[PDB]
Write a protein that binds this ligand. Structure first.
Ligand SMILES: [Zn+2]
Ligand SMILES: [Zn+2]
Lengths: 266, 266
């Protein structure tokens, strides 16, 4: 679940939760679900998103921050691996998290000292805060692989494997070359590709694949998967040159790409 | 402060905080003021008292429990020893506490796992629930000194040194005799005296001793100390027989009494 999936969740949850009192946050894991008691007995005023985090604005200056990791998603009905429940006046949201990567943080509005990942997040890719000047600066400030850097979310929040892979293919750039090795012309292509890929994905309700671990609360599948050029298409023809898409796993991280179009491969 | 001082605080504060939004509980001592963030951003629905505890009932099923201790008190103006502040929309309450014995507890309504005393407190002395049969039975089961049973609070919630001493004098009973040694007639006198002294102390707004430690919220002193017969009057004339009031200490525990009038005197 990346920015497009989480943004879709935010948009779909608003109609179902705005105005409702969050009666209780039921769970049995104070290590992963921190200070949730702070959020109880408060009316939900809004649902915001920062990166991949979901932030429920609660009456009285409090926020319930949700980290939807890599499985953790909210459902309208309980599941065998539901680890927490947000009990509202009219309905209940169940936190489906098979691999316990999810997190919840009851905090005073804006106080993210205990949420390091949220604290260092770069600007919102689809906002005016994500400007090319700063983007270019950040790239030249790093010698690490271009892909890896994008995943750190310091240059752009919410970017994961799917969209980094699709943006790199769109911009025709190797995911493995040094970030600072990019020319202004190239960096500009990636800047645009990243923004266009993310925007399109949001418009199509995100991507929905096989395992489909992550599901939207209404169960409506996304449609950006129909635009995937490389992600999840290993062995299939590159949509540009027909060459079989390659999937290389480096440092435990899998990356889809076309060796020909992205200047890599054997 | 004992039941009378705490009750006076409750009565004085209610007209000032009822219906007000508790915006924040300001302090920098999480050791003594625990989970206060739980109470923030909630309207104050009531200010209850159980024994010597003050409880602010907050919208959303939360309670801010306050234990004053030896020198704790809420003031309408800040003091050199203010340890915390309850910032309301219309005003601010300051928790004055020179000796730092006071404590604050933010808790879900009813969850007194951290304040067990609050769960075992006996009936409220000035209530229909405080009955003689139970009181008498409670005394007949103890070989411990009468006064110790008045301080237990499982028998008489809210009673401390001042009112135990004063009740015992009014009832003309030895503070040091075994609780069980009392006859039913003696027990009935102590029962009545205890209730009258507390009721009277409440009427006069609590007791402001020599240390001038206790003061109502606005700063005005209580006025029951003028009715004191033996407390804080060691060496002064008993008001009934003119003999010098004595003060026996038991392991850091003073007890004022008239030897002659209260069946003692060696
Ligand atoms: Zn290709
Ligand atoms: Zn006397």
């Amino acid at each position: 679940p990346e920015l497009p999936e989480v943004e879709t969740t935010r948009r779909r949850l608003r109609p179902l939760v705005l105005g409702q009192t969050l009666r209780q946050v039921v769970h049995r894991d104070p290590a992963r679900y921190r200070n949730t008691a702070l959020a109880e007995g408060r009316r939900i005023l809004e649902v915001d998103r920062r990166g991949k985090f979901l932030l429920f604005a609660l009456e009285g200056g409090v926020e319930l921050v949700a980290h939807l990791g890599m499985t953790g998603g909210f459902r309208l009905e309980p599941t065998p691996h539901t680890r927490a429940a947000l009990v509202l006046e009219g309905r209940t949201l169940y936190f489906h998290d098979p691999r316990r990567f999810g997190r919840l943080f009851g905090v005073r509005r804006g106080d993210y000292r205990e949420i390091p990942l949220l604290l260092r997040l770069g600007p919102e890719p689809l906002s005016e805060a994500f400007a090319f000047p700063g983007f270019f600066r950040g790239l030249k400030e790093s010698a690490r692989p271009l892909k890896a850097l994008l995943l750190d979310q310091r240059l752009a929040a919410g970017v994961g494997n799917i969209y980094a892979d699709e943006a790199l293919f769109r911009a025709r750039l190797s995911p493995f070359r040094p970030a600072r090795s990019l020319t202004e012309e190239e960096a500009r292509r990636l800047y645009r590709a990243l923004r266009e890929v993310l925007a399109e994905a949001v418009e199509l309700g995100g991507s929905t694949l096989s395992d489909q671990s992550y599901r939207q609360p209404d169960g409506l599948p996304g449609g950006f998967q129909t635009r995937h050029a490389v992600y999840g298409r290993e062995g299939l023809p590159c949509p540009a040159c027909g060459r079989p898409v390659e999937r290389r796993v480096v440092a435990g991280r899998g990356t889809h790409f076309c060796p020909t179009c992205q200047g890599e491969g054997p």
